[PDB]
């Protein structure tokens, strides 16, 4: 099952403990490997006590569709993961925000959905869990510990999020058009008017490919072409001490600027390793993250490095004839 990027599943001891603001791309990735980001969201927004992801971690998060390709690539980043990394926001749900059918919302404490305009989450709180429909949170004694299993976390869609290569607006609009040209029956996706209809059907499931080019709405696609390029950036490397654990901002920056630090073959190839010194000791070792690389999509005639890309479910409204 997938695999801890840098930190094993968390074994928390008290529901009332702090969620620290670590400052290193590493320290953060540890907090993601251990479902701290979700725990925070639950607390912050949905007024929740404790941690979700006990003993399991991000590796055990429940997914829909359960056959999630990107789940195996630990480095591939969910929408929630990237919120902690500042790349986007997962928003507290509003009545408007539609909860999709299909997923096994039951006992779930958190579920996340990419929406046509953004990314949204629906959190329960203390001693409660979602009903069999996602629509309501209800008392669940098996959630009284506040140290909850990872399975109570549902991330929907086969989403991969990454650092965008910013595109102009002209391109976005060209892309907007092409999608409408490709999907000419849809009227509103998740509530955002996609094509002019006046004759809308009632909201209905819709499973589509999509990328976040970095503008108002996601662009949806039928015939896309994806190439996963490897780029060996510093963000493609994580620095750890075998023992202490994650390394701190300076230690990482140092490692990623010095060579000295122990590392795997590629890290040496890229930035430098150094050996013959370590007697007993221990120093930060850095390693490449496990992922196909950075994805580049091809659509409308145009090649885009999108922020996020994936195939997810988005309630939508088709024409009337």
């Amino acid at each position, epitope marked *: 099952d997938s695999g801890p990027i840098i930190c094993a599943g968390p074994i928390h*001891s008290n529901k009332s403990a702090g969620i620290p603001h670590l400052l290193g791309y590493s320290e953060k990735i540890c907090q993601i490997d251990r479902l701290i980001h979700v725990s925070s969201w639950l607390r912050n927004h949905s007024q929740f006590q404790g941690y979700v992801g*006990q003993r399991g971690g991000r590796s055990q998060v429940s997914y829909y569709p359960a056959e999630n390709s990107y789940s195996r690539w630990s480095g591939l980043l969910s929408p929630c993961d990237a919120d902690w990394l500042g790349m986007l926001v997962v928003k507290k749900a509003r009545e408007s925000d539609m909860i999709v059918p299909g997923p096994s919302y039951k006992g779930k404490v958190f579920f996340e959905r990419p929406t046509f305009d953004g990314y949204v989450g629906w959190g329960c709180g203390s001693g409660k869990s979602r009903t069999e429909s996602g629509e309501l949170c209800s008392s669940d004694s098996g959630t009284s510990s506040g140290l909850l299993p990872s399975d109570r976390v549902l991330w929907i869609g086969d989403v991969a999020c990454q650092l965008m290569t910013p595109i102009p607006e002209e391109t976005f609009l060209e892309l907007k058009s092409f999608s409408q040209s490709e999907f000419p029956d849809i009227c509103k996706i998740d509530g955002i008017v996609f094509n002019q209809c006046e004759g809308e059907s009632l909201p209905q499931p819709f499973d589509v490919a999509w990328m976040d080019v970095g503008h108002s709405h996601k662009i949806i696609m039928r015939e896309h072409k994806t190439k996963w390029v490897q780029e060996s950036s510093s963000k493609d490397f994580v620095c750890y001490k075998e023992g202490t654990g994650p390394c701190s901002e300076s230690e990482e920056k140092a490692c990623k600027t010095s060579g000295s630090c122990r590392g795997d073959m590629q890290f040496c190839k890229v930035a430098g390793c150094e050996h013959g010194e370590e007697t007993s000791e221990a120093k930060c070792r850095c390693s490449l993250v496990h992922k196909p690389g950075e994805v580049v999509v091809s659509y409308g005639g145009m090649r885009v490095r999108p922020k996020c890309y994936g195939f997810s479910r988005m309630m939508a409204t088709l024409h009337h004839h």
Partner: antibody
Amino acid sequence: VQLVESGGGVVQPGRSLRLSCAASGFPFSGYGMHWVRQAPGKGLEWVAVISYDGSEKNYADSVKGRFTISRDNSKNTLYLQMNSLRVEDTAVYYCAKDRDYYGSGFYDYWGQGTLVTVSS
Amino acid sequence: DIQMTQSPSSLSASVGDRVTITCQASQHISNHLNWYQQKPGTAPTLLIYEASNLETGVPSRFSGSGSGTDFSFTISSLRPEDFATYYCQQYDNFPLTFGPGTTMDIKR
């Protein structure tokens, strides 16, 4: 909180026994449940664990194939079926609640113990 | 899997003096060692969890420290109640292993 054991007694090698850790005061269905035994004169040895809904079970060795742990969250009792009992298993048996959901290993509240002797 | 060895086997100190127990390990346990008190004839009681925290009701005389393999559990001012057997316990890897116990005894 109150865990209270019951079921212990004299038994001879080969026979089987059943224990029961009835609970009060606390949400029995939200916490994992343990079994810890103390041999007369010796120290502490954890026996078996069970999770919130009674699915994920992790026994120790020295009991695997001889011990089956179970629970009934409707009547708030913890069971432990001990078959193939041997002399090495003569000990005082405790049940313990766990702060977590699965039995991660925090024995916050202990029971008052019951005694099981195994000899012919 | 993980052998937890305590020391000393038995102390002999009188009321008011300061005690120190030591509990080692064969692997990195991180901050995942609990501590237990067991009075004779009673049931064990959790004193310190995660090697620093004091479970509700534990007085401030009892202290704990340690991270990795070597830990310690420090009583500063011994009182007649505090004379019992003390155990450490890891929870880094099931099966959950205990220590062999330290038997605090009084002195005259």
